[PDB]
Amino acid sequence: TLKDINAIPDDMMDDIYSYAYDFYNKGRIEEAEVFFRFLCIYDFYNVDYIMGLAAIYQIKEQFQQAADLYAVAFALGKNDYTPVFHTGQCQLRLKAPLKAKECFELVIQHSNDEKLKIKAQSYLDAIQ
């Protein structure tokens, strides 16, 4: 990868990541998408870069595309259940409530992030 060869300096990469989120926070989604795609080309193995791109797909209602990337993000992180939470949201939008339930249940059972667990439980409470 480009990261493996140190093709752009670390501080420049940080800046691009911040600009990507600046675009995202301002609702400049097309530009944010370009920037997160750029970041994920540069380092496919970076969980936060992958999470930024998955968030763009989720915003654009490309819920399967987002869920796929979230699954990769979880795997690379190991112990961050934030991607699993967002996968749950995607599964609800895909009309797969039992898959969604499974995601939120995993957050509740495995995560030590108390605020994330509250959010997961709020979704579980709503699922019929």
DSSP tag of 112: -
Quick note: the x/- pattern for its own copies over 45-64, rule CB under 8 A, is x----x--x---x----x--
What the block records as the tokens of 16 is 């691009």
CB of 30 to its own copies, least distance (A): 13
Q: Please identify which residue in 31, 93, 94, 102 interacts with its own copies, judged by CB under 8 A.
A: 102
37 near its own copies, rule: CB under 8 A = yes
Q: Please identify which residue in 96, 106, 108, 124 interacts with Cl ion, judged by CB under 5 A.
A: 96
DSSP tag of 27: T
Do 81 and 107 contact (CB within 8 A), yes or no? yes
Cα–Cα distance for residue pair 47/40, rounded to 1 Å:
9
Binding interface with Cl ion (CB under 5 A): 96, 98-99
